[PDB]
Design a protein around this ligand. Sequence first.
Ligand SMILES: *[C@@H]1O[C@H](CO)[C@@H](O[C@@H]2O[C@H](CO)[C@@H](O[C@@H]3O[C@H](CO)[C@@H](O)[C@H](O[C@H]4O[C@H](CO)[C@@H](O)[C@H](O)[C@@H]4O)[C@@H]3O)[C@H](O)[C@H]2NC(C)=O)[C@H](O)[C@H]1NC(C)=O
Ligand SMILES: *[C@@H]1O[C@H](CO)[C@@H](O[C@@H]2O[C@H](CO)[C@@H](O[C@@H]3O[C@H](CO)[C@@H](O)[C@H](O[C@H]4O[C@H](CO)[C@@H](O)[C@H](O)[C@@H]4O)[C@@H]3O)[C@H](O)[C@H]2NC(C)=O)[C@H](O)[C@H]1NC(C)=O
Ligand SMILES: O=C(O)CC[C@H](NC(=O)N[C@@H](CCCC(=O)N(CCNC(=O)c1ccc(F)nc1)c1ccccc1)C(=O)O)C(=O)O
Ligand SMILES: O=C(O)CC[C@H](NC(=O)N[C@@H](CCCC(=O)N(CCNC(=O)c1ccc(F)nc1)c1ccccc1)C(=O)O)C(=O)O
Ligand SMILES: *[C@@H]1O[C@H](CO)[C@@H](O[C@@H]2O[C@H](CO)[C@@H](O)[C@H](O)[C@H]2NC(C)=O)[C@H](O)[C@H]1NC(C)=O
Ligand SMILES: *[C@@H]1O[C@H](CO)[C@@H](O[C@@H]2O[C@H](CO)[C@@H](O)[C@H](O)[C@H]2NC(C)=O)[C@H](O)[C@H]1NC(C)=O
Ligand SMILES: *[C@@H]1O[C@H](CO)[C@@H](O[C@@H]2O[C@H](CO)[C@@H](O)[C@H](O)[C@H]2NC(C)=O)[C@H](O)[C@H]1NC(C)=O
Ligand SMILES: *[C@@H]1O[C@H](CO)[C@@H](O[C@@H]2O[C@H](CO)[C@@H](O)[C@H](O)[C@H]2NC(C)=O)[C@H](O)[C@H]1NC(C)=O
Ligand SMILES: *[C@@H]1O[C@H](CO)[C@@H](O)[C@H](O)[C@H]1NC(C)=O
Ligand SMILES: *[C@@H]1O[C@H](CO)[C@@H](O)[C@H](O)[C@H]1NC(C)=O
Ligand SMILES: *[C@@H]1O[C@H](CO)[C@@H](O)[C@H](O)[C@H]1NC(C)=O
Ligand SMILES: *[C@@H]1O[C@H](CO)[C@@H](O)[C@H](O)[C@H]1NC(C)=O
Ligand SMILES: *[C@@H]1O[C@H](CO)[C@@H](O)[C@H](O)[C@H]1NC(C)=O
Ligand SMILES: *[C@@H]1O[C@H](CO)[C@@H](O)[C@H](O)[C@H]1NC(C)=O
Ligand SMILES: *[C@@H]1O[C@H](CO)[C@@H](O)[C@H](O)[C@H]1NC(C)=O
Ligand SMILES: *[C@@H]1O[C@H](CO)[C@@H](O)[C@H](O)[C@H]1NC(C)=O
Ligand SMILES: [Ca+2]
Ligand SMILES: [Ca+2]
Ligand SMILES: [Cl-]
Ligand SMILES: [Cl-]
Ligand SMILES: [Zn+2]
Ligand SMILES: [Zn+2]
Ligand SMILES: [Zn+2]
Ligand SMILES: [Zn+2]
Lengths: 694, 694
Amino acid sequence: KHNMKAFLDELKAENIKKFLYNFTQIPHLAGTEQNFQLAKQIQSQWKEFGLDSVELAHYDVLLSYPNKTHPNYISIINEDGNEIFNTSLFEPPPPGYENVSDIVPPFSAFSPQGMPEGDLVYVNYARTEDFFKLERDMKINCSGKIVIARYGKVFRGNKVKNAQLAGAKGVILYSDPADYFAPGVKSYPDGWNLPGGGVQRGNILNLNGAGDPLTPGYPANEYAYRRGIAEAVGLPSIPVHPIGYYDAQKLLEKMGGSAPPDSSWRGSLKVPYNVGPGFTGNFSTQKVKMHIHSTNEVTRIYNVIGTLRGAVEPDRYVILGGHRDSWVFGGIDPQSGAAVVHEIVRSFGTLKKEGWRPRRTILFASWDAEEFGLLGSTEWAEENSRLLQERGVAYINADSSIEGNYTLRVDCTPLMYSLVHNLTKELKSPDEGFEGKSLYESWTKKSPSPEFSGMPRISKLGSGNDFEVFFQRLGIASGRARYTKNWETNKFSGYPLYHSVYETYELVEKFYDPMFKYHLTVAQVRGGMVFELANSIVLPFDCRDYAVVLRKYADKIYSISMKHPQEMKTYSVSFDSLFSAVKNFTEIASKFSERLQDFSNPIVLRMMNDQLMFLERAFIDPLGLPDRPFYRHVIYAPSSHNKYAGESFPGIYDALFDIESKVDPSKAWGEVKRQIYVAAFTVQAAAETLSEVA
Amino acid sequence: KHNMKAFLDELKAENIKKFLYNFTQIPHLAGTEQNFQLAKQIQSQWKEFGLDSVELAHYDVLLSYPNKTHPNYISIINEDGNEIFNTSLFEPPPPGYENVSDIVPPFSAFSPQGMPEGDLVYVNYARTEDFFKLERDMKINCSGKIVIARYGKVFRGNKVKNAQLAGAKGVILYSDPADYFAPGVKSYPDGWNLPGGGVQRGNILNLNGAGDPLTPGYPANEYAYRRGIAEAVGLPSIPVHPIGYYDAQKLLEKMGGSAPPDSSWRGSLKVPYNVGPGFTGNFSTQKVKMHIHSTNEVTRIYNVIGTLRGAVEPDRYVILGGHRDSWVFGGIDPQSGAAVVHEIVRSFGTLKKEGWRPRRTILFASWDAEEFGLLGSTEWAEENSRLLQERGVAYINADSSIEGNYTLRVDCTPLMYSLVHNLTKELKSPDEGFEGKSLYESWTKKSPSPEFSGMPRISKLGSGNDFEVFFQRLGIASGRARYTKNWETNKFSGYPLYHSVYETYELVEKFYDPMFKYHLTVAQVRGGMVFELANSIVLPFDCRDYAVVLRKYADKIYSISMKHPQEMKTYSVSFDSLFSAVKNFTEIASKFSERLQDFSNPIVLRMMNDQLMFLERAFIDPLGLPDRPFYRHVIYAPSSHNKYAGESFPGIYDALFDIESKVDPSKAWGEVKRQIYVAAFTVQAAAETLSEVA
Ligand SMILES: *[C@@H]1O[C@H](CO)[C@@H](O[C@@H]2O[C@H](CO)[C@@H](O[C@@H]3O[C@H](CO)[C@@H](O)[C@H](O[C@H]4O[C@H](CO)[C@@H](O)[C@H](O)[C@@H]4O)[C@@H]3O)[C@H](O)[C@H]2NC(C)=O)[C@H](O)[C@H]1NC(C)=O
Ligand SMILES: *[C@@H]1O[C@H](CO)[C@@H](O[C@@H]2O[C@H](CO)[C@@H](O[C@@H]3O[C@H](CO)[C@@H](O)[C@H](O[C@H]4O[C@H](CO)[C@@H](O)[C@H](O)[C@@H]4O)[C@@H]3O)[C@H](O)[C@H]2NC(C)=O)[C@H](O)[C@H]1NC(C)=O
Ligand SMILES: O=C(O)CC[C@H](NC(=O)N[C@@H](CCCC(=O)N(CCNC(=O)c1ccc(F)nc1)c1ccccc1)C(=O)O)C(=O)O
Ligand SMILES: O=C(O)CC[C@H](NC(=O)N[C@@H](CCCC(=O)N(CCNC(=O)c1ccc(F)nc1)c1ccccc1)C(=O)O)C(=O)O
Ligand SMILES: *[C@@H]1O[C@H](CO)[C@@H](O[C@@H]2O[C@H](CO)[C@@H](O)[C@H](O)[C@H]2NC(C)=O)[C@H](O)[C@H]1NC(C)=O
Ligand SMILES: *[C@@H]1O[C@H](CO)[C@@H](O[C@@H]2O[C@H](CO)[C@@H](O)[C@H](O)[C@H]2NC(C)=O)[C@H](O)[C@H]1NC(C)=O
Ligand SMILES: *[C@@H]1O[C@H](CO)[C@@H](O[C@@H]2O[C@H](CO)[C@@H](O)[C@H](O)[C@H]2NC(C)=O)[C@H](O)[C@H]1NC(C)=O
Ligand SMILES: *[C@@H]1O[C@H](CO)[C@@H](O[C@@H]2O[C@H](CO)[C@@H](O)[C@H](O)[C@H]2NC(C)=O)[C@H](O)[C@H]1NC(C)=O
Ligand SMILES: *[C@@H]1O[C@H](CO)[C@@H](O)[C@H](O)[C@H]1NC(C)=O
Ligand SMILES: *[C@@H]1O[C@H](CO)[C@@H](O)[C@H](O)[C@H]1NC(C)=O
Ligand SMILES: *[C@@H]1O[C@H](CO)[C@@H](O)[C@H](O)[C@H]1NC(C)=O
Ligand SMILES: *[C@@H]1O[C@H](CO)[C@@H](O)[C@H](O)[C@H]1NC(C)=O
Ligand SMILES: *[C@@H]1O[C@H](CO)[C@@H](O)[C@H](O)[C@H]1NC(C)=O
Ligand SMILES: *[C@@H]1O[C@H](CO)[C@@H](O)[C@H](O)[C@H]1NC(C)=O
Ligand SMILES: *[C@@H]1O[C@H](CO)[C@@H](O)[C@H](O)[C@H]1NC(C)=O
Ligand SMILES: *[C@@H]1O[C@H](CO)[C@@H](O)[C@H](O)[C@H]1NC(C)=O
Ligand SMILES: [Ca+2]
Ligand SMILES: [Ca+2]
Ligand SMILES: [Cl-]
Ligand SMILES: [Cl-]
Ligand SMILES: [Zn+2]
Ligand SMILES: [Zn+2]
Ligand SMILES: [Zn+2]
Ligand SMILES: [Zn+2]
């Protein structure tokens, strides 16, 4: 038989291992010749595996690279101008790789050039609330200063935006062991911990969904008109560089001024963690100086697009996508994910050679330049927007398969909650102590839902990965899944060797998943979801699950507003219309489910599958959110304070944020009310797409 | 049998006459109690006629009305301040109506209040080129002056915008007999000509598709948040009033200054048509003074929405819509159209009571507040945007059925050219001398195509009527049709009694269409188009017809650019990518037609009908045109100089318009190139929706 169980049984742990090894021997940086060569390999093997067509789609986008003969580094300089201390030029390469070329040294992609000189201020994680504490409560002014911040808690792009608006003239980012160094485990190569010479690469853009900085709205094709650099989207205006904790100890050990305001400002190093500004008396005339010479340039990138045509609904698309570009070797991020995609293509191809086809079309993607701002996914979606919005059923992401070995992590649209629950009940747990039990049972036990007994935790989608254009711009139902670490004990700053040279095949095989059983479990979840979405006669979305979280989100935003009872009376601020819309959605969705359970008629079937497909689409507002035109979904956007986190009713949340500080309360509460109107209308319009059509 | 011929044969001239008489006995001004009463009548009769459901949809929108106890008028004042001349307070009412109440006096809807005083300048039709001639060639400065302009050639809203930007402090509009008074025909009530006391009402907004000035983007429902007046869309900033040619002769007869620059500036009255500024020497200290006291206020309006459910594709919508509100009696505009809609509903209802249903759903609409800015259609479409864009097949408009008695006028999307040609070949000509001939033959003979021998003229859609939100905002295929006057001899300023008290039932029955045979022909065209669109198994759109006009539009915009050969060399301005896209569209559309002619399979059928439905939709750009976010179609927009006229490749046209006057040629030619990029990309993306889907 050709059913889901045939599909699932053909996947093998041993194939995923082989592919991960094949993908991680050399660096595959976006825009380099070796990442083009890997794209041509993937295209050739996806055709051999059986897909009906496989093509490269290329784009010419803005990337960023260091200057090979003019290295980036930081100094302490004395009164006379001698550089008495210099940060490293490279990470000590790991055992066996000490002769590999083309390892890009640590840098912050898209930093402007400069050589600023001045006094240090320590700003903790550089969050919005950390700058409020500095300027409002401690009275410390960052204008004209170089800020040093530890990585962790929020996207590094938001840290840089926050430092810029406080008037900083440069930023220094470092990894503190309190966040990235765990209890009793050794540094690479003896364990999975971060060494004092290790450094986290990463871009520092604020794109808010735009894609290529030079071509917002349109694909970066051969005849594209480009903005000049000064009008480009999302570039930072001050120099930025990342360092390891050996180098950071040298820069912090001399800091004077105010004490840390409390113990949540202290890391793990043997230093006071004083806030500054400047150094203590003996070294009060010393200074910090940055040297940054990176350049921005328009470089070609390549997506691989494979197609497996549907037998019945060839004009309905189910997409499995993940990126292929890496900062260095990509042992976890992304090749642990791309190796799983490779095995999933191979199994669907096995079925196809025996004569099977799915009901709906499945599209497979190897994205480029994800690490430089989701550029490959976003340019392809800009090019194909009209097809994706009238034909796109769902998008399943496939970056890193593991960031731990404790239990499953799922973030998705409410429309897939029921699909995920049913599929994980039919899968075996790979966890020790759950031999012979379901993945549902082990996940539910190790990661309980906050709200409901006997259910597992499923989070909201945030951003910082390739689903952003499909979900928050186009309104296609999306999901992602991987193995992760324990929720208690989790500091939410990532795995220690994230975006480092130490992130290798050996990291994975020795310390994360020696048997490749977690990789295999994640391949069954991602591939099982794609199989049901593309083969089930009725789309596997449950509209009632949207109705439950919308009531939760409305209670939450109402409670934020109720902290200001006098202003709600003065300006006549009512949430009545939002709760009314949510009630109507609950009722109409309940009636829709009853009709979906009663009906031999394919037209009623296409009609009702189309109501299910366009329900996510219904939450899109073509005018976008305020000042963020490419974030169009009214229920979900990336937090304005942290691109990695999801925010619910983001229009209303942002109109309410820090409202008590605004100068014209009347105008600020007018905008709250406008955002309440937009959200009520949009929820009611979404509900009406599920009424009888005529 | 229940086929198109049964439908067409059930329509009767005598029914249309009766309904026109019923709709034109009293005024039906938007927002008044009598227009609400007519809406309740229409709803009740559409249910009796057989429709499955009929509902009122109401909205609270900004309208404008004069002050009953504080009349608008204009004066000539002397040195001492005595008003030596006063314009009329009302039009002399016609025979038999001299006791009807609630006739709104002449006014310009949405004029601000004021009483400005100053010297007159005559500006011809107040077009863009007339202000260029005044300021650039004649050196006459309109700053601080009251301008007087004749109606005709362009939408009165564009005239007011042009006067404002020249610095005028008020505007006076009048009807000149050279435009609105024809050869050897008598004034009402003895003929169809305009009397010297007649005046044209009309709004003077510049909405650019927004709808209700207070709620751009969202419906004006019960909980809507409203902008304050100062942030409202499209309101004029100087007082404006309309007058008849007796009053205009008094204001022009004393004008001094420069002579008219040529005979195209002279009308028909016995005056010099001097441009000013001010009066000749004897009366040089006299002045003109306006008195305007109209008020803007939020008023409820009511659309009637009738539904006839489809038997096979109930989730596909074919819409027949036209307005019901009138300035006074609405003898032509709009009730000559609404009476035709009434008879079309009655005939479809006859078939339905004998057991028939159309294949697709048909929606019938009686719009409100069209005369105040397309407000009823636009608010309903804003409310129902998600349903209309995923389910809307086509929209057929139904305002005035006659503006003449010479031949047919059709303006529509290229996708309906073939449908119109085939339907008119099956219809009888009502023209004298074409007894026993087809409507196609008489139309083709009296109104030949400019391009192709043996074909009739079909124009581009412009704007100034209720199709604007469906076509240029949402991208639903649209069309309109009516009887009109002879193309040569046509001055393009409208029928003489347009928006006047003299526009009555008697006007129509005595001078336009005594037998109601032109009304009947127009009902067969509008109703035949709706019948084919809603019942034909394959949608009746031909994509190849889009491919032919796109090449024509590309040749046209290229020729405008080639007037500047040195600048095209300096800035490397190429149209190669646009011609490449148009070539690709021609080829892909040709292959699509071949597939459409070969295929018992309903899924292939739904798939291919969906490619035909979404092809118009494919020309929509979600970011809109520059500064006009609600004009989203990249091929067609209303002219920026004349809302009534259509412009092709409007992004490029406007970047090129008057480019030789721009201060920074480099920036101006950069924007031309950007607009070439957007148009090529959009044409190619549209073509790709017609490729095989997988
Ligand atoms: C959720 O669904 C329900 C449908 O079950 C929907 O109910 C609607 O609520 C509005 C109230 O905002 C109703 O509007 C009324 O319509 C009548 C005519 O049918 C009008 O006469 C009413 O106007 C008068 O009263 C107002 C209120 O005091 C005055 O301000 C106004 O000036 C008038 O004097 C009023 O407009 C509507 O009829 C119901 N529809 C029903 C019951 O079918 C509700 O709106 C939905 N929620 C959302 C957020 O959409
Ligand atoms: C209309 O349809 C045709 C399809 O039949 C489509 O043709 C495409 O044109 C572009 C040219 O803009 C081709 O792009 C090339 O792709 C190859 C790889 O396949 C590249 O190597 C080429 O790049 C090199 O050469 C460039 C030109 O000098 C250099 O600037 C560049 O730096 C490289 O050195 C080039 O990008 C594309 O392959 C064809 N596709 C085909 C034939 O399948 C055409 O674009 C369509 N028109 C529009 C407006 O879309
Ligand atoms: O340009 C961009 O938008 C992103 C490009 C690139 N993307 C990327 O590296 N993404 C990784 C890592 C995303 C960050 C992350 O996984 N964590 C791990 C913790 N997980 C969560 O915070 C988390 C967030 C939302 C959610 F619903 N569940 C868990 C994290 C958080 C804060 C700081 C540092 C790392 C991924 O999605 O796997 C980058 O972030 O530099
Ligand atoms: O607010 C709005 O947008 C419009 C509200 C109202 N709409 C209205 O009255 N529309 C009428 C009249 C439209 C104007 C018109 O028909 N002509 C008659 C000449 N016809 C054309 O110009 C024409 C335009 C385009 C085309 F493709 N074919 C003929 C005209 C033109 C210029 C000045 C005065 C009148 C209609 O569409 O039947 C108004 O214009 O005040
Ligand atoms: C990764 O696997 C690929 C595919 O097996 C290897 O590429 C093949 O290499 C052999 C020997 O050089 C050639 O005969 C084929 O032409 C290649 N196939 C392709 C490109 O599809 C590749 O060498 C492996 N890489 C590593 C680092 O082991
Ligand atoms: C997940 O599984 C449940 C339980 O099997 C499915 O719910 C059942 O669906 C059948 C078929 O329509 C109904 O007759 C039952 O009454 C349902 N049981 C319930 C709601 O308790 C559910 O549909 C599945 N979810 C999917 C496929 O998305
Ligand atoms: C226009 O036609 C309508 C419908 O025939 C007339 O309205 C009806 O009037 C009669 C007599 O007053 C009543 O019995 C009905 O209740 C009305 N029907 C409705 C409102 O649907 C109306 O009087 C006619 N108007 C004119 C001006 O002749
Ligand atoms: C208008 O009428 C023409 C002529 O009847 C239609 O074109 C024919 O359509 C049939 C059925 O598909 C073809 O087999 C013929 O070859 C066509 N003749 C041609 C193209 O010369 C045309 O389709 C009609 N237009 C519509 C329905 O929109
Ligand atoms: C790299 O640095 C050198 C200076 O040592 C400079 O001349 C060269 O142009 C730089 N490369 C760039 C900017 O690409
Ligand atoms: C740091 O580098 C600079 C430039 O190469 C050099 O002049 C200086 O001596 C170095 N300082 C130390 C302490 O090594
Ligand atoms: C911070 O310092 C600079 C002056 O060097 C000044 O422009 C800014 O206003 C200061 N802000 C304060 C003191 O709040
Ligand atoms: C893998 O599993 C073991 C078993 O608990 C755990 O102690 C170890 O830390 C895990 N490895 C990683 C990288 O978390
Ligand atoms: C109409 O005019 C009178 C003045 O004669 C004024 O008092 C009244 O308020 C006006 N009505 C309005 C502005 O609605
Ligand atoms: C015009 O009207 C005003 C105000 O009613 C009046 O004072 C004046 O006499 C009138 N002028 C003439 C010439 O009738
Ligand atoms: C028109 O007149 C006014 C002065 O009253 C002036 O502001 C404007 O610049 C003038 N324009 C000219 C003379 O071009
Ligand atoms: C109606 O038709 C006659 C016949 O040519 C024509 O002379 C007359 O002017 C027409 N009426 C109107 C209003 O155009
Ligand atoms: Ca782009
Ligand atoms: Ca509105
Ligand atoms: Cl992922
Ligand atoms: Cl019309
Ligand atoms: Zn990644
Ligand atoms: Zn990454
Ligand atoms: Zn009208
Ligand atoms: Zn009108």
